């Protein structure tokens, strides 16, 4: 049961802001409960699966970019207009010197502005709290990741240094032993030539 809220305006009253509340069940595609308010009166609509899918049958085009343009318009160029008495709401995608209709709702108002406001911000301040808690968590998690990361680097280097020591221990002048057998070869060969 999901929900989103966005600041909006209407050209019918261009000078004031408005706030669109959407609340859907597990998907925008499954229909939703829309709610509009200026802050003083309650306005709401319910459009479910069958008709929201019939939307992108009415203008013949894919539900994919249709719902994409909705969520770009509804879920934060698009223009919104609403009339209170007819309770008719519509919005349209505006392009460069051309315009084509996107969607329209005939909502139905509700009695009770205070509560919808109240719950809305209930949710909001809840949501922030959620956010910060998660943030704290993930912060702890990844700092832990980091200090293991670094300590692994350190033990890497100590292992490498042991490796380097072992390398030198046997080659660079440790093979002087082979050189000693080499000197014995030379001494024996030269003594052979001299005796």
């Amino acid at each position: 049961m999901e929900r989103k809220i966005s600041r909006i305006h209407l050209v019918s009253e261009p000078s004031i802001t408005h706030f669109l509340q959407v609340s859907w069940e597990k998907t925008l595609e499954s229909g939703f409960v829309i709610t509009l308010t200026d802050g003083h009166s309650a306005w709401t609509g319910t459009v479910s699966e069958s008709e929201i899918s019939q939307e992108a049958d009415d203008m013949a085009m894919e539900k994919g970019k249709y719902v994409g343009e909705l969520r770009k318009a509804l879920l934060s160029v698009y223009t919104f207009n609403f009339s209170k008495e007819s309770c008719y709401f519509f919005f349209e995608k505006n392009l460069k010197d051309v315009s084509f209709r996107l969607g329209s709702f005939n909502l139905e108002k509700v009695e009770n502005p205070a509560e919808v406001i109240r719950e809305l911000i209930c949710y909001c301040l809840d949501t922030i709290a959620e956010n910060q808690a998660k943030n704290e968590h993930l912060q702890k998690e990844n700092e832990r990741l980091l200090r293991d990361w670094n300590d692994v680097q350190g033990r890497f280097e100590k292992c490498v240094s042991a490796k380097e020591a072992l390398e030198t221990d046997l080659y660079k002048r440790f093979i002087l032993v082979l050189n000693e057998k080499k000197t014995k070869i030379r001494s024996l060969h030269n003594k052979l030539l001299n005796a």
Binding site: F156, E157, V160, K172, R173, L176
Partner: protein, 140 residues
């Protein structure tokens, strides 16, 4: 088994001619085939690493990346890691940030001997299989 503690009992095993060493290591590798081993399969490769936000700016370092471990692996596997993209470079390795790949290609046109540009997995695949994987699938 016997050379274990025998080496450690050596009186100061830094015995003779122990200082001028640059030419007297490759000869050791060359003469005694230190180079025929997996931990030296990058012995004859020049590698410049993209750990600098600005090419050839030594203190534009992007340290803390996983490219630092690649530097360890290359050196440990015999690559000679260089901090300057001079005319003696044969390979350049790119990490996640491709912001300088265009600069490397443009800078490559000036070179008499041209370096290759590779992704990270070339060495890792090279190291993990203990055998040189070839660069052409790792290009760019």
């Amino acid at each position: 088994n016997q050379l274990k503690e025998v080496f450690s009992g050596i009186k100061n095993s830094n015995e003779q001619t122990p200082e001028e060493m640059a030419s007297l290591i490759a000869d050791l590798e060359y003469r005694y085939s230190w180079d025929c081993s997996p931990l030296s399969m990058f012995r004859r490769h020049t590698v410049y690493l993209d750990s600098y936000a600005v090419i050839n700016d030594l203190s534009t370092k992007n340290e803390g990346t996983r490219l630092a471990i690649k530097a360890l692996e290359l050196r440990f596997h015999g690559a000679k890691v260089v901090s300057c993209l001079a005319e003696g470079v044969s390979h350049v390795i790119i990490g996640e940030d491709h912001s300088r790949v265009a600069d490397f290609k443009a800078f490559r046109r000036t070179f008499k001997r041209k370096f290759k540009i590779l992704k990270e997995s070339w060495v890792t695949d090279s190291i993990d299989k203990c055998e040189l994987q070839e660069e052409n699938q790792y290009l760019i």
